[PDB]
């Protein structure tokens, strides 16, 4: 499914993103803008070693779910990539939650750094009455 803007930023703040472990809605909706452009089948898989990142926020194999072919990887949101592939994006904002419970918070992702950092992202939640 691709969302639309406004779709998208009223099931997060309904999802309890906002403010979550203190980052505000806009930037969840920054990240996964620029992730996967609000679609929930994105896969991306990185040559360079092995992984493959799914979903909305563009989460990774080798730490946070398991698709069974990542070398020495983890599944801290205990749950297969393939429940990061649906339409219904409750487990992947329950899985995105666990991400930034670790010490670099949103951070983890670099395209947070290069397109949302320090950036104005009111853009993002302008109108959508969040």
Same mark, same amino acid.
């Given at each position: 499914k691709v969302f639309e803007r406004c779709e998208l930023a009223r099931t997060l703040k309904r999802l309890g993103m906002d403010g979550y472990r203190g980052i505000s809605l806009a930037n969840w909706m920054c990240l996964a803008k620029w992730e996967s452009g609000y679609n929930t089948r994105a896969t991306n898989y990185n040559a360079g070693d092995r992984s493959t990142?799914?979903?909305?926020?563009?989460?990774? !194999?080798?730490?946070?779910?398991?698709?069974?072919?990542?070398?020495?990887?983890?599944?801290?949101?205990?749950? !297969?990539?393939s429940a990061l592939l649906q339409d219904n994006i409750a487990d992947a904002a329950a899985c995105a939650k666990r991400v930034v419970r670790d010490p670099q918070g949103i951070r983890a992702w670099v395209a947070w750094r290069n397109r949302c950092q320090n950036r104005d992202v009111r853009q993002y939640v302008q109108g959508c009455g969040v």
């Open positions: 990142d799914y979903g909305i926020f563009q989460i990774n !194999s080798r730490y946070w779910c398991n698709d069974g072919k990542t070398p020495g990887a983890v599944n801290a949101c205990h749950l !297969s990539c």
